[PDB]
Each structure stands twice: as structure tokens, then as C-alpha cells.
């Protein structure tokens, strides 16, 4: 069996820049590679075969070089339409073995989020257990963490978070964290709040709650 | 004009069997074989067994061999599998793949994909809940994937957000959506939130109030 | 990638021996073998020797004789060559060559080159 | 800007033979070959026979094989065709075809065409 | 051998658009196919070669596609100077094999 | 096996037809190759099988010939194609190079 690895697993380069991805084999493939490309929600499309030739319909900014067990791909003058995932296929017998995948993105100057007001739940209370939402909006970069202090207490292994894909308009993200608590617990206690942290923010900010209205 | 389309795929429950068919239309299956690649829900691609034309040699993968069987048909150009003893991590999307290289260039066609889920949970309809603007929607205990969310009966509305579904505890999914709104013109448009579920046709609508 | 590097160049007292060794890195041997090629100053190229993997034919050019013994190390993928009974006209530049043709294309992978001179 | 001309035709009783040959003018015969294309009156086209460059690769259609002989004379860029045992349903307009694809766009040239009538 | 089957020889139009001609083979031929066009009294003329390509000289409005079974030709801009007959052709070895033809007329 | 190259010294203007002869002595099939060396560097492979082409090579170069007589042709020269050309032979284990051929420019 042949094992393939890709040296970079995530990239972030601005437009009009030179990027490179390296695929490394295990034993031997005598120039029998092929690079794919999969945009989200679609099917992969072939880009380059035999590690040097170019498929018809591909623009002129895609090129790559090959050797025994070391292959690279280079994109010159990156355009804001090539944000996808690139794989590294091989074919030397009856069967194929895909690589791992690499993501490329676009970089820009830092920005700050805009925290909103977080509405409690009442219909959830009527139906049973309640839930509340910590929501962020339009921040950069992605790396950030959230935590809550219910009567200044830390919760472990009870919350999950989700993040949207990079926006195609201003290159920003979004965040949303939720917590599940029992009906009986919400009856007691009075104070709960959302604590956020961001490298683009000078200091952490605090948002309070509102009960009864 | 190749239009490979495959059918089948549904809730299987642990320890069962299923069959899939990938009919070939627009060409004649006489040379080379057809592959089967599987993509995990959010991970990289992976390879599954292949079959050469006219019942020839077949090679399976390494983590699947011993439980899958593949074969073709004579009168109608189709391929089949018959699996058994499925675990919980075999839930993914299955593609139909076929390619071969010739002196005139490359040849490759791809299917469309069928979503196969393995678990122990009965189908259920979504339960829409409102988000107070003191603007958003929310679903809870909806199964199985996927679901569609639309606002004001269409239009992007210039700033809608659809967070990806997250596997909540127990065995039922959950997701939410939010809409950005200017501080003025509050309640003058009467925003609406619509959900639609294909496996269980509910099409429940909710009206939000401030 | 694949690279070839050699060492051992320098001045030599005529009539004295010298040892040449080519270092192979970036691949695994035991496929086809290597060659040694040299170029006289201002003249054309000329073939010298050949060594396949393990014991094989050791065909030499007619211009030289058994005084040009060439062997491969058993442990690593290195090739050795012994120089002796040199002459005044043996000054040249020695390269390292490994070529083999496959069903998909050619492979050349030429060396870098070192200089050997004789004088007093 | 090359041109092709065919000479022949007439009225021939069943049996006997005929002589027609399209000579190559405006170009030099090099690589690839030539073909003879029939055309029945009011029907579709039909391929007949093929001659390659020097003397090789001579093939015939199913309904003509074993009856027609085609060869190219030495030092002359002419193609000679001979037929024996002519019969009916073989009256048509005969062309001469030369077509090959390389480099830039395709090259193809068609002859003027001559009429052959077989009856009593 | 190889036998080519074409669309029915009768085809009518009213200076409209979207006229389709099909050409189905009976073996494996990959992208090696060309279309001709013959005026009622003339010599044949090439139109497109290596299906899903084009030729320098034609006034556009000609295209095709397919793989090993079916190749189609469309116009979509039928003026009144296209009337004639169109022949398939395959070239995978020494020697060709023409189709049978298809005549286009004008509906009055 | 003795191998000779006839045109020891050639010259031309900016864009012409230049021909080189690599007539061997013994009987070989289509087993031959050509190398181009610029001064102060290592050679480079140009064509193999006496008719095929390398990767990333301008289409002007085009070999020909078979059996014994072998030729190499260039459609247009340009100043960048000034170097020395050697014609090789890779039948069996041993390889014997040519003799040399230098091309120049004239203004």
C-alpha cells in the first residue's frame, strides 16, 4: 500500500500571491499523479494529469512539477475564486488512494466582532428544558474562545459550538454557542452572562442578562 | 452526454443490509470498470472496492474487505453492493466514479451522491421555536438530515446566516439561524421563518413578535 | 527531490593514487545502476565506466584498463572508484550519471561535477 | 493551394477494364496516403480503398475486395487504379481524397470528380 | 465492423432554431469523429473535427459533444444558407466509414 | 563502435533551417538521443527514440531519420539557442557519446 501526505494543512494568502503545496509518496510512483479540486457542496473536478499536462478548460495560472516521489503545485496571481480543497490522487494499478486535503483562504487586516443582545427562552421553558444562545457576528480571525459564568461558575463538558464558513463578501466569520440546562436548575440562580475573548479586542467584554422582559 | 445517477440509501439501523444501484446511461459499459468513492460527513475522501468489466478481478479496500460484495448485470448496465454488519461510523455519502486515460486526453464522470445514515432513532419532524429580538429562528429534535430554511418566502435578504447543524446529545440534531436588522423599521415587514423536511413533510411556519 | 554530490577533488602528485566517491541521496538504489562520465578541458564528453546494482558487468572504456576498479558499498547507496597510475593528460572534470527509461518518460538526474588536475 | 485532377470515364461493357488515375500536383507526396471515394447518384458516400505512402497498408471494402488493384508507381506522385469484371450497380462519380491532421488546423483536399457509366 | 446510424433523413424547420442531429456508433471510438456538409451539386466540405471542437471559417453556430456512443450537432441560428446534407465520419485507423445523410428543408 | 558527426562547425542568421548529421557505423534500431550543453554547465536531454520529444521543450526542435541516417532540424534559430550539441547512443549497457557540433551567430 502507498501512503500519501500533504505538508501544509491550511493556508492563508492574500490575492496576487504565490502559493505552493507538496505531495510526498512512500515508495515509488513513476510520474503517475493527478490533482483534484472540490468546492463545497459539489463534486470534484480534475485539474492536472501526469503531473505536468493541463486539462482543457483550466486557466493558465495553474501549473505543477513532478519527480519520482516529490510533487508540487503552484498557483500564480491568486484570484478570489479559488477557495476550495485540493487533493492528491495516484493511479498505478486497479485502485486509487487519495491524500488528505489542503485548504487555501484569503487574508486581510484584522477586525473586531459586534456582540448582540442574547434573548432568554420562555417557550422552551414551557415545553421543558431551556436553552440560551451566545452569538458573535463579523469577526476575524477565526481563533477565539467563549466561556460562561453562572453565578461565577465554570461549566465543563456541557456546551458545543459551531462556526460558519468564510463569507464571500468581506472575508469574515461568525460564531454561536449554546448550553442545555434542566428545567429545575433554571428555576434557581439569578445571574448568568457571556464571557468572550479575542486577540483583536483590547480587553474582554461583558454582556448581562434580562429576565421578565 | 453521460448522466450517471444512483438510487437507494436510507436509515439502516445497526446490524442490517442494504443494496445500491448505479445505472449507466449515455454510453456502453464494455471497457474498463467503475469505482466507488465514499466521503465522510466533513472529512476527506476515501476509496472503496472496484470492479472490472465482465465479472473480472475485484479488489476491495483494507477497512471494509470481508463484509462487502460487488457485481454487475448483463441485460442492464448496473452495479450493486450488498453489505452487512454495519457499525456507527459508516455513515457517509457514496459516489459513483469512472475514469480512464486515452491518447485523446482524459475521461472522467461523477455521480451525484446518496446520504446513508446508520443509527437507532425514529424519524421525527422539526419543532420550530422563536428567538426574541429584545431576530432569529430555531429548530430542535429534527431527524434525519437534511433540512432547508428560508426567510420571507425567498430572497437572500442581504445578511442571512445559516449555521451548520450540530449533532446534539442523544440522537437528534439541532441548528439555528439569525438575521441582521437595522435599529429602525422595527416590525414593519413581519419577518417569517419557514422550514421544510423531505423525509417527514411538516412544512411548519412560525411568526415572531417583539 | 533527487540530488547527486561527489567529493575527492584536488591536486595529486603524478604516479600516486586517488579515490573518488559519489554520494546518492533522495532515492533508493537497487533499480538500474550508475555511470561515471568525464570531460577533458575544451573537448567533448567521454564515457568511463558502469556499475549496476549488486554484482554485474563492469564494462570499461577501451582507453583505460583494470586500473579503474569500481565498486559499490554494501551498507549505503554509494559508489567508489580508485584512481592510480595517472598520466599528464588525465586532468578533466568528472560527473555522476544515472539514467533509465521507463514507460512514462525519461529520467536524467545529472550530477554536479568536480575537478581533478595533475601537475608538479 | 494544391489541386487534383482525374482522367478517365466513358462507357464500358460488362467485364473488360478501365483506367483512371488522379495525379498529385502542387505538392510533394510525403507521409500518409490517399483514398478513393465513390458516390452513387442520389445516394450517400462510400469508402472504397486506401493506399499508404510507399507500398504498404492496402485495404479494400467488403463489396470491392478481390476485384480492384491499386498501386503507386515509383518516382511518380500518381496513384493507378485497375478494375476487372465490371457489372451494373457500379455507376457513380469517383473522387480522390487526401486528409491528415497535424500541428495547426486540419488539411483536406478533394478532387473534381469523373463520371463512369457501365451498360450495354 | 463499425456501422453508423443517423437521425431520420426527414427534417423540417421554419427559420427557427434548435435542430438536433444524432449519430450513434456500435463500438468504442473516443472523440474521433468529424461532420461534413455537401451542397446539392458540389464537393464535400469539412465542418468540425475531433467532436467538441471548431473549424476556422465557419460562421459559428455549430457545436457537438459525446463519448463513445452518441454525438450530436446543433445550430440554433438556422439562417437560409444551411440547406444541404450532413454526413458523419469516423477515423480511428486506415480508412473511413461514412454515415447515411440527413436533409434539412424549410417549412412553408 | 565508432560514431562520427559530420557538421563540425555551423553558422546561420536569426531564423533559418539548420541540419546536423549523426550517421553511425553499426546496425541499430531507433535507439538514439541528443544533448545540448551550454558553456560552464551540465548537459540536458532533448529528444529520445530519435523522434519523440522531452517535456517543456520548444516545438521548433524536431528530430527525424531511422535505421542508420539520423538528422536534427530547427525551424528558427533565435539567439537563445547557441550551444553545443552531442548525439548519443544507448543500446545495451554501454553508452558512447558523439564528437561535437558548435553553432554560432553572425551579424
Amino acid at each position: 500500500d502507498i501512503q500519501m501526505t500533504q505538508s501544509p494543512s491550511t493556508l492563508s494568502a492574500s490575492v496576487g500571491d504565490r502559493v505552493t503545496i507538496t505531495c510526498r509518496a512512500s515508495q515509488f510512483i513513476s510520474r503517475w499523479l493527478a490533482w483534484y479540486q472540490q468546492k463545497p457542496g459539489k463534486a470534484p473536478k480534475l485539474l492536472i494529469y501526469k503531473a505536468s499536462s493541463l486539462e482543457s478548460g483550466v486557466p493558465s495560472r495553474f501549473s505543477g512539477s513532478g519527480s519520482e516521489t516529490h510533487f508540487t503545485l503552484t498557483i500564480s496571481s491568486l484570484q478570489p475564486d479559488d477557495v476550495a480543497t485540493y487533493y492528491c490522487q495516484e493511479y498505478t494499478s486497479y485502485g486509487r488512494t487519495f491524500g488528505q486535503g489542503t485548504k487555501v483562504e484569503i487574508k486581510r487586516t484584522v477586525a473586531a466582532p459586534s456582540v448582540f443582545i442574547f434573548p432568554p427562552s420562555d417557550e422552551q421553558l414551557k415545553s421543558g428544558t431551556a436553552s440560551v444562545v451566545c452569538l458573535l457576528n463579523n469577526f476575524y480571525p477565526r481563533e477565539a474562545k467563549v466561556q460562561w459564568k453562572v453565578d461565577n461558575a465554570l461549566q465543563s463538558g456541557n456546551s458545543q459550538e459551531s462556526v460558519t464558513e468564510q463569507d464571500s463578501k468581506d472575508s469574515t466569520y461568525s460564531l454561536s454557542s449554546t448550553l442545555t440546562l434542566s428545567k429545575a436548575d433554571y428555576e434557581k440562580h439569578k445571574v448568568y452572562a457571556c464571557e468572550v475573548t479575542h486577540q483583536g479586542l483590547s480587553s474582554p467584554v461583558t454582556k448581562s442578562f434580562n429576565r421578565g422582559e | 452526454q453521460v448522466k450517471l445517477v444512483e438510487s437507494g440509501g436510507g436509515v439502516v439501523q445497526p446490524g442490517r443490509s442494504l443494496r445500491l444501484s448505479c445505472e449507466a446511461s449515455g454510453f456502453i459499459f464494455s471497457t474498463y470498470g467503475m469505482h466507488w468513492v465514499r466521503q465522510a460527513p466533513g472529512k476527506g475522501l476515501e476509496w472503496v472496492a472496484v470492479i472490472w468489466f465482465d465479472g473480472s478481478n475485484i479488489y476491495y479496500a483494507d477497512s471494509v474487505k470481508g463484509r462487502f460484495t460487488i457485481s454487475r448485470d448483463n441485460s442492464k448496465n448496473t452495479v450493486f453492493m450488498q453489505m452487512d454488519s454495519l457499525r456507527a461510523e459508516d455513515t457517509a455519502v457514496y459516489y459513483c466514479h469512472r475514469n480512464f486515460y486515452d491518447g485523446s486526453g482524459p475521461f472522467d464522470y461523477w455521480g451525484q451522491g446518496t446520504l446513508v445514515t446508520v443509527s437507532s432513532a425514529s424519524t421525527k419532524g422539526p419543532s420550530v421555536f422563536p428567538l426574541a429580538p429584545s431576530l432569529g429562528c430555531l429548530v430542535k429534535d429534527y431527524f434525519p438530515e437534511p433540512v432547508t430554511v428560508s426567510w420571507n418566502s425567498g430572497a437572500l435578504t442581504s445578511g442571512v446566516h445559516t449555521f451548520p447543524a450540530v449533532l446534539q446529545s442523544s440522537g437528534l440534531y439541532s441548528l439555528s439561524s439569525v438575521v441582521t436588522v437595522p435599529s429602525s423599521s422595527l416590525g414593519t415587514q413581519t419577518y417569517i421563518c419557514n422550514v421544510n423536511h423531505k423525509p417527514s413533510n411538516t412544512k411548519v411556519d412560525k411568526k415572531v413578535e417583539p | 527531490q533527487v540530488k547527486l554530490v561527489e567529493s575527492g577533488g584536488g591536486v595529486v602528485q603524478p604516479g600516486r593514487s586517488l579515490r573518488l566517491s559519489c554520494e546518492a541521496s533522495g532515492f533508493i538504489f537497487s533499480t538500474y545502476g550508475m555511470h561515471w562520465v568525464r570531460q577533458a578541458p575544451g573537448k567533448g564528453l567521454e564515457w568511463v565506466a558502469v556499475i549496476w546494482f549488486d554484482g554485474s558487468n563492469i564494462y570499461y572504456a577501451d582507453s583505460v584498463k583494470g586500473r579503474f576498479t569500481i565498486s559499490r558499498d554494501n551498507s549505503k547507496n554509494t559508489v567508489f572508484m580508485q584512481m592510480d597510475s595517472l598520466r599528464a593528460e588525465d586532468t578533466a572534470v568528472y560527473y555522476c550519471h544515472r539514467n533509465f527509461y521507463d514507460g512514462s518518460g525519461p529520467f536524467d538526474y545529472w550530477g554536479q561535477g568536480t575537478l581533478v588536475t595533475v601537475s608538479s | 493551394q494544391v489541386k487534383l485532377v482525374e482522367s478517365g470515364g466513358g462507357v464500358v461493357q460488362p467485364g473488360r477494364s478501365l483506367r483512371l488515375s488522379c495525379e498529385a500536383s502542387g505538392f510533394i507526396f510525403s507521409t500518409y496516403g490517399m483514398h478513393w471515394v465513390r458516390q452513387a447518384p442520389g445516394k450517400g458516400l462510400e469508402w472504397v480503398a486506401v493506399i499508404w505512402f510507399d507500398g504498404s497498408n492496402i485495404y479494400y471494402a467488403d463489396s470491392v475486395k478481390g476485384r480492384f488493384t491499386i498501386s503507386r508507381d515509383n518516382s511518380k506522385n500518381t496513384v493507378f487504379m485497375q478494375m476487372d469484371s465490371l457489372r451494373a450497380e457500379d455507376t457513380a462519380v469517383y473522387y480522390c481524397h487526401r486528409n491528415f491532421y497535424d500541428g495547426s488546423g486540419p488539411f483536406d483536399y478533394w478532387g473534381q470528380g469523373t463520371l463512369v457509366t457501365v451498360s450495354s | 465492423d463499425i456501422q453508423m446510424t443517423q437521425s431520420p433523413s426527414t427534417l423540417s424547420a421554419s427559420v427557427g432554431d434548435r435542430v438536433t442531429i444524432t449519430c450513434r456508433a456500435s463500438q468504442f471510438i473516443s472523440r474521433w469523429l468529424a461532420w461534413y456538409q455537401q451542397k446539392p451539386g458540389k464537393a464535400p466540405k469539412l465542418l468540425i473535427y475531433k467532436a467538441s471542437s471548431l473549424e476556422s471559417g465557419v460562421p459559428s453556430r455549430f457545436s457537438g459533444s459525446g463519448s463513445e456512443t452518441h454525438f450530436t450537432l446543433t445550430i440554433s441560428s438556422l439562417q437560409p444558407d444551411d440547406v444541404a446534407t450532413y454526413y458523419c465520419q469516423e477515423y480511428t485507423s486506415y480508412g473511413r466509414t461514412f454515415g447515411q445523410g440527413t436533409k434539412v428543408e424549410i417549412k412553408r | 563502435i565508432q560514431m562520427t558527426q559530420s557538421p563540425s562547425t555551423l553558422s546561420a542568421s536569426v531564423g533559418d533551417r539548420v541540419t546536423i548529421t549523426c550517421r553511425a557505423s553499426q546496425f541499430i534500431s531507433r535507439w538514439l538521443a541528443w544533448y545540448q550543453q551550454k558553456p560552464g554547465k551540465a548537459p540536458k536531454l532533448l529528444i529520445y527514440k530519435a523522434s519523440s520529444l522531452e517535456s517543456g521543450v520548444p516545438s521548433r526542435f524536431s528530430g527525424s531519420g531511422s535505421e542508420t541516417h539520423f538528422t536534427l532540424t530547427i525551424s528558427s534559430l533565435q539567439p537563445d539557442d547557441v550551444a553545443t550539441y552531442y548525439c548519443q547512443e544507448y543500446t545495451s549497457y554501454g553508452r558512447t557519446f558523439g564528437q561535437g557540433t558548435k553553432v554560432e551567430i553572425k551579424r
Partner: peptide
């Protein structure tokens, strides 16, 4: 023929053949 410098093989996914009507080394 066959030389000791060229290996005999054929990848199953590629068809080794050349059309006599097209001249290779083109794209």
C-alpha cells in the same frame, strides 16, 4: 525489440497506441 534500460510494462488505465492520421507531440 527490448533493451535492459527500458522496462516492459503497461499501466491498466492507459491505452498505448497512436493514430496514424494524427502527428504526435501536439496539444
Amino acid at each position: 525489440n527490448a533493451n535492459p534500460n527500458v522496462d516492459p510494462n503497461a499501466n491498466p488505465n492507459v491505452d498505448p497506441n497512436a493514430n496514424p492520421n494524427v502527428d504526435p507531440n501536439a496539444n
